[PDB]
Design a protein around this ligand. Structure first.
Ligand code: HEM
Ligand SMILES: C=Cc1ccc(C(=O)O)cc1
Ligand SMILES: [Cl-]
Length: 393
C-alpha cells in the first residue's frame, strides 16, 4: 500500500540538488515510508498542509526533529513554543505574537529601512561583494540583534547557534553529531543573554520579560521565550535574502520588473521564501491512529513534512520552479501553516522587503562573478557564498 523509498533526505547528495528526489517523493504517492530513518513522509502540498493544520493528531510536543521526546532526551530543554502543543502552546505564543506585533513593526520599520538603504549604498562603493557574508548575512546582523536588545559582545555566536538548532532537528548523522560537539560556547552565550538584565530596554527581549505578569507566562518562562527568538529566524532570513539576490541575478528579467515597480519588493521576497524554502522540512509525531492520503498511520510515528517540496508541487503551483515576483504567493508553507505558523514572519518579511526595496531603487544589475557555494544543514537550505558584481542605477 505505502511505497517504501531509500532516499535519504538528510544526505549531502540530496542537499546538493534536492529537486529531482522531491519529485520522486511526491509522485510515489501521497504518503511514503522512508526506510533510511523509519519515518513517514509527505511531500505534496495537500498532505503537508493537512498535517500542519491538524496539531491534535500530528503533535509537536514529542519533538519536531527526528528524535521522539517520549523515547530520547531532548538535546536541550524543550522550547515552550515550537515544542509545545495547545493549550500549553497558546499563551506563550500570544506573548511572542504581541512582542513581534504590527505595532512593534511600525516602531522599527523606518530604522530597518534606513539600514537596508545604507548597506546597499555601502556595497555599491565596493562593487564586487559576497552577497551572503556582505549582504544577506550582514544586513540582518545589523538590525535584528539590536532590535532584540543584545549587547555588542558575543554576537558571533548567533548564526552558529542558529545552525546548531537546525542541525539538531535532523537524524543522528555527522552534521548533527558535529554540531552538538561544537555547541557548548554558543549555548552558553545564548542562555546568558536570555536573562532580563542582559536585554536592553524597549527591545524584543525586554518586552518578553515585561510580559510576565498577565497570567500568560511567568518570570521563569521568559528566558526560554527569549531563547526561541535567538534559536529561530536569523539564518532563515539570511538564506531568504540570499536566495532573492541569487534569483535576481539568475533571472535578470525579474530584477528589471522589480526596478520598474519597487512596490513589488515585499512579494519578491515572499516568492524567494517559497522558491528557496529556507526551512526545508519539519517533523510531527502522531498521537493516535490516523488516516492520511489513504494510508493508516499508527500512534507514535514520526511524519516528515517536505515544506520546500510542497512549495514546488505542480499540483498546487503553476511553473513552480520559476521565480515570479508577481506570483500569488498566498498559501505557501515556507513559514509553516496553522497554529505554529512562524511567529516571527512579520520581522523576516520586513527585513526582506526593505532590502529588496533598496536593491530595486539603487541597483541596475546583479551579475554572479565567482563560484557559488552551498551551506549544508540538516533542515536549512541556503548559500554559503554568492560573489556578485553590483552595478549602480
Ligand atoms: C524567512 C524567514 C523565516 C522562515 C522561512 C521561517 C520558518 C518557520 C517555520 C516553517 C515555522 C513553523 C514551525 C513548525 O510548524 O513546527 C516557524 C516557526 C517559528 N519561527 Fe520562523 N521563520 C523565519 C523567520 C523567523 C524570525 C525572523 C523569527 C524571530 C524573530 C522566527 C521565529 C520563529 C518561532 C519562535 C517559531 C515557533 C512558532 C510556534 O511554534 O508557534 N522565525 N518558522
Ligand atoms: C523554525 C525553526 C525554530 C527553531 C527553534 C524554535 C524555538 O526554539 O522555539 C522555533 C522555531
Ligand atoms: Cl541550547
Amino acid at each position: 500500500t505505502i511505497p517504501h523509498l531509500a532516499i535519504d533526505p538528510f544526505s549531502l547528495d540530496f542537499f546538493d540538488d534536492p529537486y529531482p528526489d522531491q519529485q520522486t517523493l511526491r509522485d510515489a504517492g501521497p504518503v511514503v515510508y522512508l526506510d533510511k530513518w523509519n519515518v513517514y513522509g509527505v511531500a505534496r502540498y495537500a498532505e503537508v498542509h493537512a498535517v500542519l493544520n491538524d496539531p491534535t493528531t500530528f503533535c509537536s510536543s514529542r519533538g519536531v526533529g527526528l528524535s521522539d521526546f517520549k523515547k530520547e532526551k531532548p538535546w536541550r530543554p524543550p522550547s515552550l513554543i515550537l515544542e509545545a502543543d495547545p493549550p500549553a502552546h497558546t499563551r506563550p505564543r500570544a506573548v511572542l505574537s504581541k512582542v513581534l506585533s504590527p505595532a512593534t513593526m511600525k516602531t522599527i520599520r523606518d530604522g530597518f529601512a534606513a539600514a537596508a538603504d545604507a548597506k546597499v549604498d555601502e556595497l555599491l562603493q565596493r562593487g564586487c561583494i559576497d552577497a551572503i557574508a556582505d549582504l544577506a548575512e550582514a544586513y540582518p546582523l545589523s538590525v535584528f540583534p539590536d532590535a532584540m536588545g543584545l549587547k555588542q559582545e558575543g554576537r558571533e555566536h548567533l548564526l552558529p547557534y542558529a545552525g546548531l538548532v537546525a542541525n539538531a532537528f535532523g537524524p543522528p548523522n555527522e552534521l548533527r553529531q558535529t554540531a552538538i560537539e561544537r555547541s557548548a560556547p554558543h549555548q552558553a552565550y545564548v542562555n546568558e543573554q536570555c536573562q532580563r538584565p542582559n536585554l536592553a530596554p524597549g527591545g524584543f527581549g525586554a518586552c518578553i520579560h515585561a510580559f510576565t505578569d498577565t497570567g500568560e507566562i511567568t518570570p521563569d518562562e521568559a528566558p526560554l521565550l527569549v531563547r526561541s527568538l535567538l534559536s529561530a529566524g536569523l539564518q532563515e532570513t539570511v538564506n531568504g535574502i540570499g536566495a532573492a539576490v541569487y534569483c535576481l541575478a539568475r533571472f535578470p528579467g525579474e530584477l528589471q520588473r522589480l526596478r520598474s515597480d519597487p512596490t513589488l519588493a515585499r512579494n519578491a521576497f515572499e516568492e524567494a521564501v517559497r522558491f528557496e524554502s529556507p526551512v526545508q522540512t519539519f517533523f510531527r509525531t502522531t498521537t493516535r491512529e490516523v488516516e492520511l492520503g489513504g494510508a493508516v498511520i499508527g500512534e507514535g510515528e514520526k511524519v516528515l513534512m517536505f515544506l520546500g517540496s510542497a512549495n514546488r508541487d505542480p499540483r498546487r503551483w503553476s511553473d513552480p520552479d520559476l521565480y515570479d515576483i508577481t506570483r500569488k504567493t498566498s498559501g505557501h508553507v515556507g513559514f509553516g501553516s496553522g497554529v505554529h505558523m512562524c511567529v516571527g514572519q512579520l520581522v523576516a518579511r520586513l527585513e526582506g522587503e526593505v532590502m529588496l526595496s533598496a536593491l530595486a531603487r539603487k541597483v541596475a544589475a546583479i551579475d554572479i562573478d565567482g563560484p557559488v557555494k552551498r551551506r549544508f544543514n540538516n533542515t536549512l537550505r541556503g548559500l554559503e557564498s554568492l560573489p556578485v558584481k553590483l552595478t549602480p542605477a
